[PDB]
Amino acid sequence: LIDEVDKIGRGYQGDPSSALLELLDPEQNANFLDHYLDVPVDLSKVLFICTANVTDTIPEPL
Amino acid sequence: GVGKTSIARSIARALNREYFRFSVGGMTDVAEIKGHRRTYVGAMPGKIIQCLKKTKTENPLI
Numbered sequence: 001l002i003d004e005v006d007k008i009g010r011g012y013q014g015d016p017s018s019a020l021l022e023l024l025d026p027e028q029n030a031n032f033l034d035h036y037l038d039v040p041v042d043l044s045k046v047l048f049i050c051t052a053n054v055t056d057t058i059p060e061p062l
Numbered sequence: 063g064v065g066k067t068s069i070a071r072s073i074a075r076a077l078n079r080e081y082f083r084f085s086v087g088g089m090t091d092v093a094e095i096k097g098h099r100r101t102y103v104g105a106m107p108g109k110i111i112q113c114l115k116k117t118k119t120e121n122p123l124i
């Protein structure tokens with residue numbers, strides 16, 4: 001579960017939305033790897049939910 | 063939503079070369095393109111370097 005997705009600052013040295021996009025990619029998610037850990041991990045069987053009070057300030061690509 | 067990404071993947075499949083995509087749009091910093099100076103605490107090279115790594119190919123599709 002993810003909350004306040006619309007509230008993401010996405011400011012300096014941030015831009016986590018890309019990761020979120022990379023998190024939410026139907027195909028790339030299956031090979032996700034971290035900065036701490038480089039091995040890829042499946043994410044096709046994990047269910048994701050996002051919550052916001054507005055459908056607009058959320059990134060369009062996301 | 064016209065098939066451009068799909069046909070890019072199809073092109074890579076037909077040519078046998080690797081397919082990797084990434085979104086540069088709405089990105090200001092150039093570090094991820096060129097990594098960091100390697101002196102900053104906890105630095106990686108550019109995302110192109112990560113592609114060259116995970117691909118294990120010299121002529122992938124970018």
Ligand SMILES: Nc1ncnc2c1ncn2[C@@H]1O[C@H](COP(=O)(O)OP(=O)(O)O)[C@@H](O)[C@H]1O
Binds near residue numbers: 064065066067069
């Ligand atoms: N000519 C086509 N043949 C097969 N599939 C198509 C065609 N045009 C569009 N599509 C489908 O529509 C979707 C559009 O998504 P995408 O291609 O990623 O957008 P864009 O074309 O803007 O990159 C694709 O997943 C693709 O399956």
